[PDB]
Design an enzyme around this catalytic site. Structure first.
Site, PDB file in Angstrom:
ATOM      1  N   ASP A  22      80.544 -68.404  54.321  1.00  0.00           N
ATOM      2  CA  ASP A  22      79.842 -67.230  53.810  1.00  0.00           C
ATOM      3  C   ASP A  22      80.830 -66.116  53.479  1.00  0.00           C
ATOM      4  O   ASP A  22      81.277 -65.394  54.377  1.00  0.00           O
ATOM      5  CB  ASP A  22      78.848 -66.760  54.862  1.00  0.00           C
ATOM      6  CG  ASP A  22      78.062 -65.555  54.421  1.00  0.00           C
ATOM      7  OD1 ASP A  22      78.110 -65.218  53.237  1.00  0.00           O
ATOM      8  OD2 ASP A  22      77.377 -64.953  55.276  1.00  0.00           O
ATOM      9  N   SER A  41      81.641 -56.824  37.239  1.00  0.00           N
ATOM     10  CA  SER A  41      81.485 -57.620  36.041  1.00  0.00           C
ATOM     11  C   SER A  41      81.427 -56.713  34.824  1.00  0.00           C
ATOM     12  O   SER A  41      80.945 -55.582  34.886  1.00  0.00           O
ATOM     13  CB  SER A  41      80.199 -58.441  36.155  1.00  0.00           C
ATOM     14  OG  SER A  41      79.897 -59.120  34.956  1.00  0.00           O
TER      15      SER A  41
END
Length: 330
Positions: A35, A199
């Site tokens: 994770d 992004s």
């Protein structure tokens, strides 16, 4: 040193991925959920409340000659999906894919929430976010990667998750045969303890690319892609009959639909998520309403590039003094 381990989807939907981890001496192999959005290595154990264990493999520290109780140490974690666990702490030898760390903090669960009990395939979590998020008290502990870093050939790990197929976690090296083209690296903020990046925009299907900054985290422990409501609405508007269902808890769509791809930007590069990757199947057995793999982050507080996005890429988690992330197509 290096390590390399195969990671395997737990079910036919790729809801999560499990990777075998050797703990203790002799080794006890547990299948952990790696994770990158958390920083605790915790396991089902001989200390876990018996009624909360249902098929998981447990770590038994009393059978490990290298286990040592970390005196006074406790841990307690709550995840973004509402699940939680807590317990005490041992140090022990932990190996992943041939890479060994001695003295790793292994957090032994005394209690786990129902979602963990109900998932017999996941024996615990191995956190790969920054150690500042580790919950051990009163002395915070380091992640497996943080402990291994100095010994690795290069201070990196890579995630290569498969679509409906196994993939690979590598530690300490870049497998240049595992991706196409080049790797585009992008800046990371560690201020929240995550692999947080920005992004450069998105496209829906064959549509035009929208240049816009989307800050979010690269999180292998989250199944879906969680993005701003504007972006998610633009995606599902291209699927006839798709709608946000308050009762189901997100966007659903007719199982008869063909889904468009979704592209996200990494600098000037582009990662394309095929439409198939966005199908999470019937909302309940036999239903013709299917659950979408792109969902709004509006109720989270952060955008999350979970497995739906990451499995479309070869992802480099560069843990150099100034960390960065790399993405390549594959």
């Amino acid at each position: 040193s290096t390590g390399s381990a195969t990671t395997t989807p737990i079910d036919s939907l790729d809801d999560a991925y499990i990777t075998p981890v050797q703990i203790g001496t002799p080794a006890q192999t547990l299948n952990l959920d790696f994770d990158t959005g958390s920083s605790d290595l915790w396991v089902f154990s001989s200390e876990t409340t018996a009624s909360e264990v249902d098929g998981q493999t447990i770590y038994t520290p009393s059978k490990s000659t290298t286990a040592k109780l970390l005196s006074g140490a406790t841990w307690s974690i709550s995840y973004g999906d509402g699940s939680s666990s807590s317990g005490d702490v041992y140090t022990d030898t932990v190996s992943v894919g041939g890479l060994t760390v001695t003295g790793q903090a292994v957090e032994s669960a005394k209690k786990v929430s129902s979602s963990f009990t109900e998932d017999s395939t996941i024996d615990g979590l191995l956190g790969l976010a920054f150690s500042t998020l580790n919950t051990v008290s009163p002395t915070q502990q380091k992640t497996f990667f943080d402990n291994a870093k100095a010994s690795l050939d290069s201070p990196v790990f890579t995630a290569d998750l498969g679509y409906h197929a196994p993939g690979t976690y590598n530690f300490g090296f870049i497998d240049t045969t595992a991706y196409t083209g080049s790797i585009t690296y992008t800046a990371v903020s560690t201020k929240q303890g995550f692999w947080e990046w920005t992004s450069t925009g998105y496209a829906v299907g064959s549509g035009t690319f929208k240049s816009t900054s989307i800050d979010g985290i690269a999180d292998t422990g989250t199944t879906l892609l969680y993005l701003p409501a504007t972006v998610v609405s633009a995606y599902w508007a291209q699927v006839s009959g798709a709608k946000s269902s308050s009762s189901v808890g997100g966007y659903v769509f007719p199982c008869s639909a063909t889904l468009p791809s979704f592209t996200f930007g990494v600098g000037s590069a582009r990662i394309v998520i095929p439409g198939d990757y966005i199908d999470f199947g019937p909302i309940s057995t036999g239903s013709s309403s299917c659950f979408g793999g792109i969902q709004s982050s509006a109720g989270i507080g952060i955008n999350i590039f979970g497995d739906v996005a990451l499995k479309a890429a070869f992802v480099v988690f560069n843990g150099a003094t100034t960390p960065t992330l790399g993405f390549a197509s594959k």
